[PDB]
């Protein structure tokens, strides 16, 4: 069977700016075993979770990261916001599934979990499935920064600082995005 467990059950998830991709190949996938086993979000575009078990694809990608609850809505075709624009962008014609669950009991800490970051500053929007891991000081003026933070010179990433007492819109959510591409078709339902 396809190794979804390694994705969904990873101990640690990536920061959304540095989102992880697992390329799935040459295996059989029960996507109905997923679509009940427990998820606050399970939205499919251009496919149904039921119909996936009688379909074959060249490859499947499993993208995974953490964002805050109120940002899960940006993980959909046609959205704008700091997450869709600067961190993780789905194409308008997306074919796949967005799956999310509250991870407050795994990813929040007393005093703040500062390990999860997002890109706040960027001069232009990401292309679909673009990953920007630049740490370059953001030049907000005409004066070059020369790697030093100061006036008009900003670290481009910010921390969520997840705390267990946060309201649910500010709690961490683990997200997995399944993308299906159509060479010989190597990933099939049973």
């Amino acid at each position, epitope marked *: 069977l396809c190794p979804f467990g390694e994705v969904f059950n990873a101990t640690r998830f990536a920061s959304v700016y540095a989102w992880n991709r697992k390329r799935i190949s040459n295996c059989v996938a029960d996507y109905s075993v997923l679509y009940n086993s427990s998820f606050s979000t399970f939205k499919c575009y251009g496919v149904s979770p039921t119909k996936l078990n009688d379909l074959c694809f060249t490859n499947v990608y499993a993208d995974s990261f953490v964002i805050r609850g*109120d940002e899960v809505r940006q993980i959909a075709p046609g959205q*704008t*916001g*700091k997450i869709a*624009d*600067y961190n993780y962008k789905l194409p308008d014609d997306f074919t796949g599934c967005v799956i999310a669950w509250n991870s407050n009991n795994l990813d929040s800490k007393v005093g703040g979990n500062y390990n999860y970051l997002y890109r*706040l*500053f*960027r*001069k*232009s*929007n990401l292309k679909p499935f673009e990953r920007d891991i630049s740490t370059e000081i*953001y*030049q*907000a*003026g*005409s004066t070059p920064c020369n790697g030093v933070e100061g*006036f*008009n010179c*900003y670290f481009p990433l910010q921390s969520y600082g997840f705390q267990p*007492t*946060n*309201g649910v*819109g*500010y709690q961490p959510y683990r997200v997995v995005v399944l993308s299906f591409e159509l060479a010989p078709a190597t990933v099939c339902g049973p």
Partner: antibody
Amino acid sequence: EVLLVESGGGLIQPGGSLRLSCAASGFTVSSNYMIWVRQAPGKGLEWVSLIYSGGSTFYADSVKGRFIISRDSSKNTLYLQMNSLRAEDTAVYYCAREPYGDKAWGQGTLVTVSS
Amino acid sequence: DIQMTQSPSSLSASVGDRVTITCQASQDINKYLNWYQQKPGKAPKPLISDTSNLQPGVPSRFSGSGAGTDFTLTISSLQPEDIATYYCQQYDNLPITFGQGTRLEIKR
């Protein structure tokens, strides 16, 4: 030192169009988050519009479909295009480098919507 | 929309008094709350960002605290130059929304 200077405000009839300009010095408009905020005479502050570092735009429901926020990098200027103006749009309009970066507010330009 | 309610709407205090202005959000905004000072006949000036961070050129007699739905601006030693309307603002959840403002008068 950062300067923001709004202009373009004045008397306009209901249904008319105005363009406000906010000329910036000391930072690059096209690289920054900026907003328009308004204040009706003797009232509080109301958010109008937002443009992201990368150009995504957001609007208050009361101005959606009427107002357009934009910027011209060659002139280092932020705009607010205001169409189908109503008496309740009457206000001092402020531009600001907000909500991210070194914060700065302009001095405001007065828009009076009246026949 | 997140409604912001400040308390009180006006106050009058003596020179040297410790003044408290509160701001309640109708839902959680975490730390993402700003304070502004608007002096008679000026534009709003940033005073505090993200609950407690002092802006450039604001004396340390100003401070901010709170979290979630409940926030406080404290002026520790009121001076006549502090005559102003103070506004809270939540910015991290669109639409950006402001409190209705607190008018501050100084006694003599």
